[PDB]
Each structure stands twice: as C-alpha cells, then as structure tokens.
Amino acid sequence: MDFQHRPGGKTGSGGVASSSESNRDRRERLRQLALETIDINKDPYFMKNHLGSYECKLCLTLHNNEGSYLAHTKHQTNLARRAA
Amino acid sequence: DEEELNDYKLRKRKTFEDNIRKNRTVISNWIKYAQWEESLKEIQRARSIYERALDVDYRNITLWLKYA
RNA sequence: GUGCUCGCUUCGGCAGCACAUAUACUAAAAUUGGAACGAUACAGAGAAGAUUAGCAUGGCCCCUGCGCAAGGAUGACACGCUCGUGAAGCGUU
Ligand SMILES: [Mg+2]
Ligand SMILES: [Mg+2]
Ligand SMILES: [Mg+2]
Ligand SMILES: [Mg+2]
Ligand SMILES: [Mg+2]
Ligand SMILES: [Mg+2]
Ligand SMILES: [Zn+2]
Numbered sequence: 158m159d160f161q162h163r164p165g166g167k168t169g170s171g172g173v174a175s176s177s178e179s180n181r182d183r184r185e186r187l188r189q190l191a192l193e194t195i196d197i198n199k200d201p202y203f204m205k206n207h208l209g210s211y212e213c214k215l216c217l218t219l220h221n222n223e224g225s226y227l228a229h230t231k232h233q234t235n236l237a238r239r240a241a
Numbered sequence: 242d243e244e245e246l247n248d249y250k251l252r253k254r255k256t257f258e259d260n261i262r263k264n265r266t267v268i269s270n271w272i273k274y275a276q277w278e279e280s281l282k283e284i285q286r287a288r289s290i291y292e293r294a295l296d297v298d299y300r301n302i303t304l305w306l307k308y309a
Numbered sequence: 310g311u312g313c314u315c316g317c318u319u320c321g322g323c324a325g326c327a328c329a330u331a332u333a334c335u336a337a338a339a340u341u342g343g344a345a346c347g348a349u350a351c352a353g354a355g356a357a358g359a360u361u362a363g364c365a366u367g368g369c370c371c372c373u374g375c376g377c378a379a380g381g382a383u384g385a386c387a388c389g390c391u392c393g394u395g396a397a398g399c400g401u402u
Contacts, residue, residue, distance in 0.1 A: 165361040167354060167382075174359075186358070262368070263387055 191223035202232075215239055253277065268294060268301055275307065 174182070195203050202215035203226065211220035216235045220226040257274040264270065271294035278287035291308040298304070 161362080163362095165363095167361080169354070170360085172360095179359080182358075258369095259387090264367085269390090 187223050191227055194227070202236075250281070265297060268298065268304060271297070272303070272307055 202213045204212040204214055206212055206219070211223065211226040212218070213220070213226065213229055213232065216229065216232055218229065220229065257270065257277070260270045261274065271290065275287045275290040275294070278290055288308075291304065294304050295308070
C-alpha cells in the first residue's frame with residue numbers, strides 16, 4: 158500500500174477528545190480570550206467572584222458567560238452615575 | 242557554597258559555549274561571555290575569549306574597543 | 310652437524326679446513342579503562358483549536374545503511390534586539 162500517502166497518524170496517540178472535553182476546552186479558551194481582551198482594554202470594572210463568576214462593579218451586575226460581560230460595554234450611563 | 246558556585250559557573254559557561262556554538266558570528270554572545278568572565282575576576286580567561294572573538298571576526302570595532 | 314686431511318696417528322678421539330650466522334607485539338600472564346542499553350524508575354510525540362504530510366538550514370550530536378541514495382518523531386537539538394545621564398575630542402565666545 159501507499160504508506161507515504163496514507164492519512165497521518167502516530168502511535169501512542171490517545172485519540173480525539175469527546176464533546177465534553179472539547180466543550181470545556183472551548184470554554185477555557187473563551188475565558189482566556191475574554192481575560193486577554195480585558196487586560197488589553199484595562200477595564201477595572203471586571204471582577205471574579207469567590208464562586209467564580211464575572212461581575213461588573215461599575216454596573217454591579219453578575220454575568221453567566223464571558224460574552225455576557227463582553228457585551229456589557231447600559232454601562233456608560235451606569236459609569237456616569239457611579240462616577241459621582 | 243563553593244560547590245554551588247562552581248556548578249553555577251559551569252552552567253553559565255556551558256550556556257555561553259552553547260550560544261557561541263549555535264551562532265558563531267553573533268558577537269554579542271562573545272561580549273556577554275567576556276564581560277561575565279571579567280565580572281568574576283578572571284582576566285586571562287576573558288583575554289582568551291576576546292582573542293577567540295577577534296580570531297572569528299577582526300573587523301569589528303567594538304571587540305577591539307571592549308578588549309582595550 | 311656434515312664432509313675431507315701430503316695430519317697426530319690410533320683406528321676411538323684430538324687438531325685444522327670448508328659449509329651452515331641472529332626468531333619473537335618476546336605471556337601459558339599480572340595489570341589497567343571503558344562500556345550494549347536491557348530491568349526498574351525518571352520520562353513524554355513540531356508548526357498560536359484538534360488531527361497531522363513533510364523538505365531543509367548550523368555542527369565538539371549521532372544511529373541504520375555499500376552509499377554523492379533513503380530512513381531514524383519533519384532523527385534529535387538549535388529566539389529577543391526608538392530618549393536622557395556622564396566622559397573624551399573638535400570650533401566660537
Ligand atoms: Mg496545533
Ligand atoms: Mg520522506
Ligand atoms: Mg531525513
Ligand atoms: Mg516518518
Ligand atoms: Mg510526521
Ligand atoms: Mg531534520
Ligand atoms: Zn458595566
């Protein structure tokens with residue numbers, strides 16, 4: 158057989174991860190991307206709870222997902238209200 | 242403390258020699274090795290390092306300037 | 310050792326002549342220092358999601374191969390350099 162034209166595979170691989178492992182890896186990567194964009198934007202309103210949840214201290218609003226806080230950018234009117 | 246200092250100096254010299262052997266023409270590795278040898282008060286070792294660097298590339302101004 | 314003597318002369322030998330002229334890492338040893346990489350253990354498969362084909366490039370890194378062929382995880386290994394502070398020299402005051 159064409160050994161140099163078979164699809165590539167290596168011994169001792171372990172296989173492809175399941176849906177749950179890929180889902181939690183995607184969630185961890187989304188958390189890392191959200192933290193990278195928060196550190197790039199340098200927003201001090203972001204906080205992580207003791208139970209591990211996103212919180213807007215300028216809005217005082219909890220967020221279930223990272224994109225919930227990423228869409229929380231109302232926040233300008235709440236920042237103007239909490240400025241004084 | 243003397244054996245730990247000897248192991249640290251051996252590790253630093255091994256990394257400097259590996260950085261020299263990886264890229265010979267990069268003279269900043271030679272300058273850093275010679276300044277680290279001069280900082281440990283080894284005049285003839287740094288003189289041998291500078292002479293090796295001048296044998297590698299004698300046309301550089303900064304090698305002559307730093308060795309003088 | 311062999312052969313022969315205008316020998317000494319017994320019949321054995323002596324003497325003389327001629328030929329033949331330099332082996333061995335000299336050990337049947339005492340020593341000495343280097344190690345296959347197998348067992349256990351450490352260990353953990355390149356390319357910014359995952360599964361991955363690879364060709365190179367450098368040399369105090371090698372192995373398989375008869376190789377100027379081809380393999381060995383792509384054989385392995387092989388990233389961080391726009392302003393002030395001082396000093397020296399030069400020309401003006
Ligand atoms: Mg990848
Ligand atoms: Mg090939
Ligand atoms: Mg190859
Ligand atoms: Mg292969
Ligand atoms: Mg491959
Ligand atoms: Mg290669
Ligand atoms: Zn907010």
